[PDB]
Amino acid sequence: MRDLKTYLSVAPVVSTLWFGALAGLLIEINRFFPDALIF
Amino acid sequence: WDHVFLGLFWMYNSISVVIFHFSWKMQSDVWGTINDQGVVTHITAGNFAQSSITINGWLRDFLWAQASQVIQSYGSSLSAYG
């Protein structure tokens, strides 16, 4: 379990989760505040 | 390994000219619409036999002519291809 957590903390997994979260965020923001060219 | 490396480029070359061969031949001498009484109008009207005999023919009648669809695909469902 500790080993599995360590694996989940490895660079590619961390990157997939981080950029996944970011992608989700930017997507939702661009869904609620769409076509933003100013601000 | 470096021979595999160069061989890859040459395989790309060969397969590229092969698929170009297929595309042009099919669009020119095979595919197309057929009218009543049996009149066949091909997509590129059988130009292969006269056009594919020079590099300039491939440059103009194949590449230049047929890249039209991809280069003006913007603003449509095919835009992803552009």
Binding site: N30, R31 | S76, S77, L78, S79, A80
Partner: protein, 82 residues
């Protein structure tokens, strides 16, 4: 092919309907990629040739495609376990 396609409609009229089995979500304008493929459906035209296979296999409904999907998923599990 079962959930996001125009396969049945295509079965009704294969000669004037474009095979499509991918649809995109409506954000940042990519909705435009969902084009008029026919059958009262909007999406990306596929060129894999699955529709003609499915017609050749005698498949007529989306339900059968669903079942085949479940079967394939099961088989994926079985291969992994193996």
């Amino acid at each position: 092919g079962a959930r996001f396609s125009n396969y049945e409609a295509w079965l009704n009229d294969p000669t004037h309907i474009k095979p499509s089995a991918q649809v995109v979500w409506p954000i940042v304008g990519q909705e435009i990629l969902n084009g008029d493929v026919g059958g009262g459906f909007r999406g990306i035209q596929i060129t894999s040739g699955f529709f003609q296979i499915w017609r050749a296999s005698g498949i007529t409904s989306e339900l059968q495609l669903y079942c085949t999907a479940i079967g394939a998923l099961v088989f994926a599990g079985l291969m992994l376990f193996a």
